[PDB]
């Protein structure tokens, strides 16, 4: 269903 | 063979045009990225879509930006556009097979199970992501 | 730039495509993306692809031509001419890179080297439509 | 149809 984004913090 | 190799690399390694981000310093990008992220995880897709597009305009070469925007198009069922960006992230981002797995998802939805099949097989040969390989064999098995 | 597993490909002589086991069908699909985006005027994407393809296979004349065409369009005439010189060494009897080099040399304020490119085209190309333009540029250069 | 736009080899058909 919904793709999983890389989490923030560089 | 060696000077052909390096002539090529030399020409690309000066054809580096801009880094796009128009001297609008780094950790600022981060904050925008972080809300794009927070809008996305929250399901405020219209905002998250503006933020990622804005970031991709500013720095087309950052794989996380491309991946965020691709993910939005995926969620919006703009599957051709998602797959187009995933091919870009692949060409930028070179290691990860995530954009290839998501392209399989897209091709499935674009009525091209053959292409979809090839994507998931590629992930299976080349990924070292255990979880991703599982998902990818699962899709593969399902469309046999 | 970043990834110099490109330095290993170099001294060892292999391409990164081989080093990373990328299927030909995959390279061909990235090529088609690169081609379509290019013909469609989507030059920023096409450049991303052609760059990838040139990095993964520095010996592919068609990849080198694509990237050099992109640099020509973007007016990076020095980089385009350097790549055309490589594409010519690879294909070593297609005169299209030599013609387009003549176009770059003209924009680099080097009309004499542009003239010798075009002469080289007329002297050796068997391509008629290429010779016609080469001969037009040669006539226009005085 | 512009002379300043090179024409690239079509992808293997």
UniProtKB/Swiss-Prot annotation, chain A:
The entry describes its oligomerization and partners as: The core secretion machinery of the T3SS is composed of approximately 20 different proteins, including cytoplasmic components, a base, an export apparatus and a needle. This subunit is involved in the formation of a pore, called the translocon, in host membrane. Interacts with IpaC/SctB. Interacts with the needle tip protein IpaD/SctA. Interacts with the molecular chaperone IpgC, which prevents premature association with IpaC/SctB within the cytoplasm of Shigella cells and protects IpaB/SctE from proteolysis. Interacts with the host protein ICE in the cytoplasm of infected macrophages.
Q: Where is the signal peptide?
A: none
What is the purpose of this protein?
Component of the type III secretion system (T3SS), also called injectisome, which is used to inject bacterial effector proteins into eukaryotic host cells. IpaB/SctE and IpaC/SctB are inserted into the host membrane where they form a pore and allow the translocation of effector proteins into the cytosol of target cells. Interaction with IpaD/SctA at needle tips leads to the formation of the MxiH/SctF-IpaD/SctA-IpaB/SctE ternary complex, which is essential for host cell sensing.
The organism that produces this protein has a lineage beginning with: Bacteria, Pseudomonadati, Pseudomonadota, Gammaproteobacteria, Enterobacterales
Region named Mediates interaction with human MAD2L2 = 1-8
Tell me where on the tree of life, at the top rank, the source sits.
Bacteria
Native source organism of the sequence: Shigella flexneri
Q: What induces it?
A: Synthesis of this immunogen is repressed at 30 degrees Celsius and restored at 37 degrees Celsius.
Mutant lacking the gene: phenotype: Deletion mutant shows fast constitutive secretion and displays increased adhesion to HeLa cells. Mutant is non-hemolytic in the presence of sheep red blood cell (RBC). Mutant displays normal secretons.
Q: What is this protein called?
A: Type 3 secretion system translocon protein SctE
Localization (cell): Secreted; Host membrane; Host cell; Host nucleus
Q: Which residues of the full protein are shown?
A: 63 to 72 of 580
The record's similarity note reads: Belongs to the SctE/SipB/YopB family.
UniProtKB/Swiss-Prot annotation, chain C:
- Coiled coil ranges (UniProt) are none
UniProt GO cellular component terms = cytoplasm
Which keywords does the record carry?
Chaperone, Cytoplasm, Plasmid, Virulence
Membrane spanning segments where? none
- Matches recorded under SUPFAM superfamilies: TPR-like
- Which protein family is named in the record? Belongs to the LcrH/SycD chaperone family.
Q: Which compartments is it annotated to reside in?
A: Cytoplasm
Stated name of the protein: Chaperone protein IpgC
Q: Name one GO molecular function term.
A: identical protein binding
Write out the function statement from the record.
Answer: Assists the correct folding of nascent IpaB. Once it is bound to IpaB, it binds to IpaC and impedes their premature association that would lead to their degradation in the absence of IpcG.
User: Where mainly located?
Assistant: cytoplasm
From Swiss-Prot, chain D:
Q: What happens when the gene is disrupted?
A: Deletion mutant shows fast constitutive secretion and displays increased adhesion to HeLa cells. Mutant is non-hemolytic in the presence of sheep red blood cell (RBC). Mutant displays normal secretons.
Q: Where in the cell is it found?
A: Secreted; Host membrane; Host cell; Host nucleus
Mediates interaction with human MAD2L2: annotated span: 2-11
Q: What is the effect of changing residue 2 to A?
A: Loss of interaction with human MAD2L2
What triggers production of this protein?
Synthesis of this immunogen is repressed at 30 degrees Celsius and restored at 37 degrees Celsius.
State what this protein does: Component of the type III secretion system (T3SS), also called injectisome, which is used to inject bacterial effector proteins into eukaryotic host cells. IpaB/SctE and IpaC/SctB are inserted into the host membrane where they form a pore and allow the translocation of effector proteins into the cytosol of target cells. Interaction with IpaD/SctA at needle tips leads to the formation of the MxiH/SctF-IpaD/SctA-IpaB/SctE ternary complex, which is essential for host cell sensing.
Entry remark concerning the domains of this protein: The immediate N-terminus is needed for recognition by the secretion apparatus and chaperone binding. The N-terminal region is necessary for interaction with IpaD/SctA and the sequential maturation of the T3SS needle tip. The C-terminal half is key to the activities needed for formation of an active translocon and possibly for translocation itself. The extreme C-terminus is required for efficient needle tip binding, and its absence also affects regulation of secretion and adhesion to and possibly invasion of host cells.
What's this protein's family per the entry?
A: Belongs to the SctE/SipB/YopB family.
This one is known as Type 3 secretion system translocon protein SctE
